[PDB]
Amino acid sequence: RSWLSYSYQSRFHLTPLSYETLEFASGFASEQCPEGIVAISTNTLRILALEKLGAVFNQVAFPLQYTPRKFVIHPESNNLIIIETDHNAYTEATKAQRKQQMAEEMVEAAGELAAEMAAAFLNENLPESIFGAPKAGNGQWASVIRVMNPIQGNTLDLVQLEQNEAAFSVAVCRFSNTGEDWYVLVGVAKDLILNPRSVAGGFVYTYKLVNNGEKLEFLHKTPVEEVPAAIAPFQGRVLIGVGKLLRVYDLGKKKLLRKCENKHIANYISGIQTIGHRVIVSDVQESFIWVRYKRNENQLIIFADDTYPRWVTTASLLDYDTVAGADKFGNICVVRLPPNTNDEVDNGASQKAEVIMNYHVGETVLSLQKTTLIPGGSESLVYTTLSGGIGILVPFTSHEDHDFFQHVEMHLRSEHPPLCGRDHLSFRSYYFPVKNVIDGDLCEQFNSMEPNKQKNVSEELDRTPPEVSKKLEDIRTRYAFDYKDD
Amino acid sequence: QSKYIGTGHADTTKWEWLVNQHRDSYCSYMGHFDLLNYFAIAENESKARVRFNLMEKMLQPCGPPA
Amino acid sequence: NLPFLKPDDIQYFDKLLVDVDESEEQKERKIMKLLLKIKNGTPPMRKAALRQITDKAREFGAGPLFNQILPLLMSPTLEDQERHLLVKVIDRILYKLDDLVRPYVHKILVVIEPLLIDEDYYARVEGREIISNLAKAAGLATMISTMRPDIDNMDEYVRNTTARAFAVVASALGIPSLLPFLKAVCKSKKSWQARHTGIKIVQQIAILMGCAILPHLRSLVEIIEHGLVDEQQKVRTISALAIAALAEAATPYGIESFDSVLKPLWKGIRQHRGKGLAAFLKAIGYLIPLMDAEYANYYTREVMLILIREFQSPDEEMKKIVLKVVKQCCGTDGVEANYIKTEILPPFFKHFWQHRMALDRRNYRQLVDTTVELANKVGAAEIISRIVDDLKDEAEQYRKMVMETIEKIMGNLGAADIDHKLEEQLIDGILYAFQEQTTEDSVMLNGFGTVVNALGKRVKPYLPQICGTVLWRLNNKSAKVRQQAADLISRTAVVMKTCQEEKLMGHLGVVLYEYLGEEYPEVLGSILGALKAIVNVIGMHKMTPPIKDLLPRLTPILKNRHEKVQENCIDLVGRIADRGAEYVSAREWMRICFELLELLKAHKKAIRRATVNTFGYIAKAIGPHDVLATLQNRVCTTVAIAIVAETCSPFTVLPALMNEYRVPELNVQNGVLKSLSFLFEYIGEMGKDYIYAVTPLLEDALMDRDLVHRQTASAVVQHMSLGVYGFGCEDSLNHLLNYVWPNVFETSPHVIQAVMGALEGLRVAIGPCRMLQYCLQGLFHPARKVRDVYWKIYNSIYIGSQDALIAHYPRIYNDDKNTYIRYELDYIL
Amino acid sequence: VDMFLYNLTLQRATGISFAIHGNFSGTKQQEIVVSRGKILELLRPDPNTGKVHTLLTVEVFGVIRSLMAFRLTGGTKDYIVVGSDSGRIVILEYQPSKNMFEKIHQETFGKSGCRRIVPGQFLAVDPKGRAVMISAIEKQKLVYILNRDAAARLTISSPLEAHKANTLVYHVVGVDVGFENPMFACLEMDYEEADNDPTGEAAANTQQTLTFYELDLGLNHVVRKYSEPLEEHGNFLITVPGGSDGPSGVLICSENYITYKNFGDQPDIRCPIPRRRNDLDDPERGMIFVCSATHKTKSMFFFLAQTEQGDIFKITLETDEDMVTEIRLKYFDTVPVAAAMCVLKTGFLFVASEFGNHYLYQIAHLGDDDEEPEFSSAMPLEDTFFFQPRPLKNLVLVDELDSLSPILFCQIADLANEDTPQLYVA
Amino acid sequence: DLIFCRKQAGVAIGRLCEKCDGKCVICDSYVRPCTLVRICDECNYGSYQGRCVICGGPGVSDAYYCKECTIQEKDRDGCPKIVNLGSSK
Ligand SMILES: [Zn+2]
Ligand SMILES: [Zn+2]
Ligand SMILES: [Zn+2]
Predict the structure, then answer these.
(1) CB under 8 Å, gap of 24 or more: what pairs does C668-676 form?
(2) I need a surface site. Which of A14, C44, C211, C218 has the fewest CB within 10 A?
(3) Which residues pair with A238 in a beta bridge?
(4) Do D37 and B6 touch (CB under 8 A)?
(5) Where is the site Interaction with SF3B5 (chain D)?
(6) Shortest Cα distance, chain B CAs vs residue D197, angstroms
């Protein structure tokens, strides 16, 4: 990356640029750009400028057509397979045929026949992004599959689906029976009446993804009775969640052959993630279900479940025994199997899974991911939210730090209460009591208090306000972005 | 307890209970921003019209009683 | 049946003492002793009867209503709360009797208007309230037509109360409704009493309305402004006073509305004398703070000549008006401090700071406060220096005035403005003024300690002389003034520490120590307080009365009957135990512990809290390894065990406390249950690591044994659940819930309410989800006895955390006639 | 294996739920207090460069449900009343010297959470700042009185109960009365009959009622003074300026209609919502307004009402004497669907979109003096008016604030050649 | 016999006498006075101004709910001035 080192009040800074790799640069100064940088990258010349000095999450936006539901990483191509589904919508063909139908009905008024307003109506397609989307209908939908290169903004492939078909799942994988050929499975639904809920059926499209992830060609379209909203590769085969039924599917030349099935899941399958051996199912309402797949019989056995109902939105496996899950109501939990759980067995299940973490974020989380944000740092549980916000959950390395930040939380709860009369502990215990989380957003407000309060709180912890502030910065230095260059 | 709307007693019918929790649910949707966001994204309708239909479902939910 | 009748109630309710029937209007009066049911009775009688008299308010008519209410409201023996009830029922019947009260309006006012001038504030607000409701029942033209003849009445009393009543109806019906009436009456040509009365109505509208005038301020000012040039001096005076009231209520906004009044007033300042000049000057004084900076400079300079001239007026009201005007002028930002220093201060301190001003209390307060406010803008030294030399006056009251003035000034601004000469003048004047005291002046104490603390480390060169005077006064006047010197030491100890004069505090230490045998308890308390203030700053090894000697002298003083001696003594014991407990043997500390154990039951909160703190300190010094296992009245021992388990980890006392439960006797098991309850409630969060240890004891005691075991054990579960809430103890508390739940069915109110409280605590700590899960089964159980209790628990879980239950309600499939599925939550993106 | 966690935010929420404007700094400059989900934020649009800078951002650790600003008589600084998921109402004052929200007042009336009958969802203020009304969705309504003391500091009174059992509130709005007794108009709907009729007939033909609550200041009590049923259900109201400027009254936005309905002898005036020419939408679908902005001048006043299709109309009211003659709507422009809009002096419009990025435009022209058709309630038809959507011709895009809401998927991976992983956000 | 007032509390601070100085108005617990007590305007009027919330004597300090009552939001019910269902005196 291109990093900028500059001194600031006898204190250096080495902040990287939110930009692609560059090959050369030199200082620039013109009337168009008084203070800029001329940088050459691979086969391109760029006149740039560094106006803002603060480091934030900067973006480059690739416009889409419909609302995206999920995308998957193709390992070889490093490209994206995105499904874009929208309620109350028309497909492009329906927009054309309906627009034209209106054009035909325009002439039937028999007005002196001599007026061609259709020549001005069929000509101009108003920009759908600014003038709103011309979309309506209660059973109508619009879903599109797209192959996009993440490096540039170009779209590699585009597949427009039928009128009332709505894709909710997608995956990219290979099958054991076939060679090293990459397949793209897309779960679709037909005639969705959302309220009240009623479905006609579902489909599963299979694609060959030839040209190292550049084109999709139609293999087959296997039908099914209920909407499949969960697709996951599992031991050379694909686990598909259709309704409340979790099925093991293999690839066939004519259709996706059903190899196994389980129908004891409570309500409806929203998501599924699997370690190499186990299967973690996300019920729409009844939290997580642990399912083992017996290799000898192709028999899915439920060997554990949760003691609390959870309207799950997303999840991620932290290890072989713990799952971190998000909530429709804006909560996050971590559930761990007890170490004595027997995998091979045959109010819901016998052995239950204990919830080791509860924490109300306040904004509905739709993506959890355990990853390292910067080179050299440690893994963090980065989550995104429905309000366009990015957060992290961070483990403590020693009990001394846990007690420290915990006492900071207790102090700031009384000395720096929330601004709108809310109780902090009650707010974070919205639906479930807080279990093993310290609100760092509250803790970092230590810097905003009056100096006498910083002195009282710090002296209560046998420290000084600068020491508290630095110890709060250490978390960001370890797990987040810190560009302080001594 | 009796004067708090949503409170129950021994002769509370299932219809009263579920219209109670239904109205509670609709008002909770009105409150929590990201919930109304999830619902307004599921069905392609603006926040305003989703709130409006949630208000129309206040004397309507579970239909008429027995 | 009738309620109880008082002797003064016979006159008004005599006709209920006999059974009569079949009378007419006698039926009305008889059923109107409903009033007697409201006045004397229980809250149910007052509410039910109140509703009965409001529903039939139209049917009864206004005539009989007020004919029976007004004599009650006039009874001299009427209590204030009874009068308030009569006011409430008057309002409630006035709301229904919209038009019927018109022919009786006058008959009400002649009875109510006196209440507007009563010495009782609440009676005045009653009169204002019922006159307002009377103004909303009847029309505006009804009140105007009823009250117009009393405008030009020759008696000033009825004019005054009439103007006040018009202000009340103006507050009830709004200013614009009464604007034209005032615009006409204030220009009435018939007599000057009418215009004077309407202008008084404007003034009372200012006083009563307050800051709600601002939108109509220009309207009122325009209606009233002409009175400044009338040939009647009285209407000019009351017009200027009403302008001053409007400016006071509009502060700090609304300077524009007074525009058309600024120039006349000014001109009048040159051609008026007497009390009309005082009214004009008052209006100026309340108008200047509303102006901008430059215009405040211009106008204040424009009136300062006549103001300075009236600094030496023979009238007292004049001196006080112009003094308030001086404070208001020098409070405004436009009047620079240099101008005040050049043109205001010399005549101010020449004419206003006299010996005859210290005798009057009103002149005393006015001059002191005004002078300090002058110091807030012109500086501290510029004011203090002019009155320092007066600290050496022979008249003691003058020394009190200058002392209080300097104390407030230095308390507000500090000592950074004071040079060395004024500093020595301060030390001299404060020493001399403090030495020759005819009594114990608290003003001289606050001034001495305030000037000392203000100087801070600058007082070091004077500390030998100061402590000399404090010792002389500390041995003088035969114990009468000793406690004042002790308070002075207590207030200057920290400054004596920050001046490196510790041995002097040592002399004070031994001299104070040799007075602990004081017979006057109020003085001994101040001795102990001064000792406490010295110990808080002195090194433990520099105490000239060694702690080895000081503490055993303090141990017998704990038996003192006086509350001050107990509080200060206990506090001193605690300071010794916190700072230098290494100088006292463990036997002494134990003897102190059981000299303070009974004081944990003291009625005064300060003594209780003090004994708790010092008990925690001595328990921290000794350590909990050796305290008595248990000893008649277990409450102080319960608080003792809680204190020991709070200062030192409960890992030390919980094993023995639970060991006392193994004995087969019952009342001691209840005792250890109570001490466990107050234990966990007191420690709060520290019980997060001590729940698994106390689990089995609560398993046995929680099971059916004695009803009290289950009761206090459930209370233990409640206190643990509330103190540990938020620290990841769902497994243990969820485990004890499985035992608390069998005790859900019980009829003894105390134990069932303790179980309910435990269910609410376990609700906040475990979560409403689990509580609803346990509570779901018996909500629709066929039996009613279980539906009562389970629905009750469901009510406790629903009132608290109702918004949380939205995520825990189970899925219930829709039947044929209804739609019971929440489809929104089933959405999947 | 003890697992203790520690939460932190890296990118605070960018989606806007509320947006008010006023002189929060106490100067001539106008700022925009916006509310994200759980974060109160103070922004300042620059009249020079036209960029929106975030002056302040505070995490309130609670669910903000209503946001209003007010000013006392003769005042020069706007306070901030915040209705939260707490059982408390809070009045705040921004301090430029300290760059912080000073909590001026906080009163406790109910339980915590976005509850059904606990106030905090609705918040309407008297346009003269004399009283504030905080109300729940159902059955509970409270009114506080605001009066400054001698030190010019705002003071609050005890709450005044205005409850009404079995009542649902669609929207509350303070009525602009010229220093008369404060009025609070709101949309109500009584469901007491609909729950006691197993046939469902009481459920139907049950329409909402526009009700005017009066605050008797002289008697210190609130009374349901006025009420009248509405022809069709409305979604929200608009305060029509009264007193010295314009005639008092409220605008009721309704399914396919807008209705000025001032009370007294003022007759109800209705105008159909104009529809775009040749709608590709299903004709069975209706059309409502999503939000409204109000601009008041000593000379005139107008409104800007946006539809579900993002159609901003400039609504104007002609008037004779103290009565209104007609509602005149005119097609202004089109922007994305906004959850709130703010019309500022010096000609700027802040559009906080309900989803996606936010926008700041400069008002080049008022929307009149062009030849576009201007519709009126007095125009007869029975059929609705039609207009042609056009590119931006009354506004120019001056700033665009990137908002990530709503984030539906996220993969944090190193797809580029760089070493630090990137956040790939769908 | 005895019951809480439970009307809408206003801006009037509740007081406590020297004997009832450190208890929660609801549960009589002396530990951790957390949240200040508000009482309705009617209970704080005239002769009752500054009176005790528990026993009705001359108040010398301020009344506080305990921490346990604040956790359970027992401070957010009606005003807790104990009233006897007897005469008004
Ligand atoms: Zn008491
Ligand atoms: Zn009360
Ligand atoms: Zn309590």
Answers:
(1) C669/C701, C669/C709, C670/C706, C670/C708, C670/C709, C670/C712, C671/C630, C671/C634, C673/C701, C673/C708, C673/C709, C673/C712, C673/C713, C673/C716, C674/C634, C674/C638, C674/C712, C675/C634, C675/C637, C675/C638, C675/C641, C675/C642, C676/C716
(2) C44
(3) A233, A249
(4) no
(5) 286, 308, 354
(6) 7
Q: Is E24 annotated as a binding residue?
A: yes
Contact status, residue C574 vs residue C617, Cβ threshold 8 Å: yes
Q: Are D158 and D105 in contact (CB under 8 A)?
A: no
CA of E74 to the centre of ligand 2 (A): 15
CA atoms within 13 A on the CB side of A167: 30
Q: CA C325, CA C560: separation in Å to the nearest integer?
A: 54
Axis-axis angle for helices C121-137, C156-173 (nearest 10) = 60
Experimental method: X-ray
**Rounded Cα distance, D361 and D341, in Å:** 11
Proximal ligand: closest to the CA of E77:
2
Residue D395 Cα distances to A50, D330, D338, angstroms: 29, 15, 15
Nearest bound ligand to CA E56? 1
A163: left (phi over 0), alpha (psi -120 to 50) or beta: alpha
Q: How far is A317 from chain B (nearest CA, A)?
A: 24
Would the CA dihedral through C742, C745, C751, C752 be positive or negative? positive
Residue E62 C-alpha, separation from nearest chain C C-alpha, in angstroms: 12
Count of domains forming chain E: 1
Q: Which domain holds residue E15?
A: 1-89
Contact B1 C795 (CB under 8 A): yes
Ligand-binding annotation for E17, yes or no, is yes
Sorted by where each begins, the domain ranges of chain C are: 1-810
Question: Which among C386, C494, C384, C496 is positioned nearest to C447, based on CA atoms?
Answer: C384
CB within 8 Å of chain C, chain A residues 184-223: 194-197
Residues of C in contact with D111 (CB under 8 A): 799-800, 802
CATH code of the domain in which D9 resides = 2.130.10.10
Say how far apart CA A194 and CA C674 lie, in whole Å: 57
* Distance of alpha carbon A41 from alpha carbon A37, whole angstroms: 12
- The verdict on a CB contact (< 8 Å) between D158 and E73 is no
Note whether C509 and C534 are within 8 A (CB).
yes
Cβ neighbours of E43 in C, within 8 Å: none
> Is D122 within the bounds of a domain?
yes
Sequence-ordered list of residues with C-beta below 8 angstroms from that of A462, at least 6 positions apart, any chain: none
Report residue C159 as tokens.
């004019």
Radius of gyration of chain D, Cα coordinates, nearest whole angstrom: 23
CA distance C259 to C264: 10
List the domain range (segments joined by +) for residue D371: 5-401
- Alpha-carbon dihedral angle through residues A47, A52, A55, A57, given to the nearest 10 degrees: -70
Calculate how far, in angstroms, residue E23's C-alpha sits from the geometric centre of ligand 3: 7
How does C408-442 read in b/e, with b if 16+ C-beta sit within 10 Å? bbbeebebebbeeeebebbbbbbbebbeebeeebe
Report the alpha-carbon distance of residue D188 to residue D208 in Å, rounded: 5
E34 marked among binding-site residues: no
Shortest CA distance from C126: residue in chain E:
E46
CB contact under 8 A, A387 and B45: no
Euclidean distance between CA atoms C489 and C474, whole angstroms = 10
The reply to whether D176 falls in a domain is yes
- Report the phi/psi class of residue C71: left, alpha or beta, with left for phi > 0 and alpha for psi in -120 to 50: alpha
List Cβ neighbours of C123 (8 Å cut-off, separation of 6 or more). C80, C83, C115
Q: Residue D379: how many CB atoms within 10 A of its CB?
A: 13
CB half-sphere exposure, C536, CA atoms < 13 A = 18
Q: Is C41–E72 a contact, with Cβ atoms under 8 angstroms apart?
A: no
Our count of domains for chain D comes to: 1
Which chain D residue lies closest to A57 (C-alpha atoms)? Answer: D11
